[PDB]
Symmetry: C2
């Protein structure tokens, strides 16, 4: 069991008096740093020279290099892409850590799969808002926020959980709901969800439907609406009220078709396919494949991206979206 937690469950204001460095100033970094400052926390930014550096000083943040920001900080939150974190950590963060420091991530990939090992006299925590940077910043400004997972990988000080929860509170997530997890569970469920369902499964399902229709001789423009455009309405309904609300709102013909045909398409064998996807997440195979592709100059990602640029549903879709305000 696990109960959702809120501001009243943040027992200790553990970020009190802490010097906070956010590493990276992309959308994610910006949202965290800005939210914490508005909450009333001492935030500085650690990023390599460039546009983000300049914008960081434009926004009024004491901006330093990654190495120096880590030197100054009690709490260091690393918000950079997974594939560059190991290099960045080893070269700029690790030599500038001190005992009793705390290092945070928003996703557990590098820590869980042990591409990064933080010294054992240093806390490692996680606050993982379930939203993109701009939504994390915006909802905070509007007065609430985006819900989040929190976790602790290693607790050297005894303060790590309180730091994680206070970070969550500081970025607005505690205003709407928190769920405690582990680094292992967050990492494996997050990878599995996006691969089997949210991104991989979904786009593949859409593409397969589009192919069946267009290959059967139906017009691609019309197929676009029937497998893609109208999905927003459906998912918005599920988001708000689950399968129940969605199926109430659609016609009984559609509802009946849902019940009857859903299981013909997504079968036991498909569920087995998902189990194989989960297995390669648990055993480290996917993680190694991704890092290896990155190290090799992204050749698989390159081929995937150029292929996806040439999909008929993507060309037709671009034209149709152009033709609609």
């Amino acid at each position: 069991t696990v109960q959702m937690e809120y501001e009243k469950d943040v027992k200790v204001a553990a970020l009190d008096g802490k010097k906070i460095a956010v590493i990276g100033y992309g959308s994610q970094g910006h949202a965290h740093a800005q939210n914490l400052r508005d909450s009333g926390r001492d935030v500085i930014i650690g990023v390599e020279p460039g546009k983000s550096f300049d914008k960081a000083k434009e926004d009024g943040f004491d901006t330093y290099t990654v190495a120096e920001a880590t030197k100054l900080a009690d709490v260091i939150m690393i918000l950079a892409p997974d594939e560059i974190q190991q290099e960045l950590y080893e070269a700029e963060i690790a030599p500038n850590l001190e005992a009793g420091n705390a290092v945070g991530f928003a996703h557990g990939f590098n820590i869980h799969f042990e591409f990064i090992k933080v010294p054992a006299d240093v806390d490692v925590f996680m606050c993982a808002p379930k939203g993109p940077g701009h939504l994390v910043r915006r909802t905070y400004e509007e007065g609430f926020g985006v819900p989040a997972l929190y976790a602790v990988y290693q607790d050297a000080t005894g303060n790590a959980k309180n730091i994680a929860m206070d970070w969550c509170k500081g970025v607005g997530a505690a205003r709407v709901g928190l769920l405690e997890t582990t680094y292992k569970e967050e990492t494996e469920e997050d990878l599995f969800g996006e691969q089997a369902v949210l991104c991989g499964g979904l786009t593949a399902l859409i593409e397969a439907g589009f192919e069946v229709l267009t290959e059967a001789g139906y017009a691609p423009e019309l197929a676009y609406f029937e497998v893609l455009h109208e999905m927003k309405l459906i998912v918005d309904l599920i988001y708000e009220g689950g399968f129940k609300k969605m199926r109430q709102s659609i016609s009984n013909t559609a509802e009946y078709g849902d019940y009857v045909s859903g299981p013909r398409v997504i079968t036991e064998q498909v569920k087995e396919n998902m189990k194989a996807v989960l297995a390669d997440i648990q055993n480290g195979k996917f993680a190694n494949d991704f890092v290896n592709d990155y190290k090799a100059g992204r050749p698989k990602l390159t081929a995937y991206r150029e292929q996806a640029a040439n999909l008929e549903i993507e060309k037709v879709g671009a034209e149709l979206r152009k033709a609609m305000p």
Copy 2:
């Protein structure tokens, strides 16, 4: 096929026409209210009284289905697919006159020939791609929902102009119209909802949820990873296709999408979809749906009760209760 707009509606074919909307659910109310706002002469045909009264309250001349038809030049049937044949035979057909026009928002009954309209009467379709609530709402905002239009039989020579002018009257021509046939609209619409939008999607999500919970992961967290976070992804696809979605997610998620999507949705799944399409084309699904209705909805009953006991539905309801927005 090219997208068409208000400028492509040559003739205001609904000019001087007495219009009856049959049915006053969300669909009926949306069409009727939009057309009245567009200045059309609209009456309502519906049984007493829990729809009849709401119609009268809204200020419509409201009659029985039989009497509304008798008065009307154009009759739009906006009742559940499964009850249209009975309603048409008993109340509508006896009150048609040559040169009348009968419309539908979905081609189910006409295409599968559960209903046969006399050869001196036009049969047209305007099929907005959204629920009634949405069709009315967007209209009030000075916007609209895109629509398909089609003609099944054209006795007067005016059927296409009638269909397009209906589309225009309900606000659809403000955003975009696509011409189709009754056959392609019916078959593509049934296939999309069954294989992808509703059936495929809910089954995909449920399978993901099962895999996670059966592997020992917490269901609260599984809810977010296969359902809650899907809205963000689909909003991105709605706005900019697979391309925009995959630009916006992490490179880790994007790579996982490309690699695991095809592992889950395979050639065999595509074959499963082809079987779904076939049972739509050959009329087997249509007969199954109507036969379930005639038998007192026993399959729908069992399906609905099973769906109410889904763990993802119970957990999701409790989680959505714990979250405001």
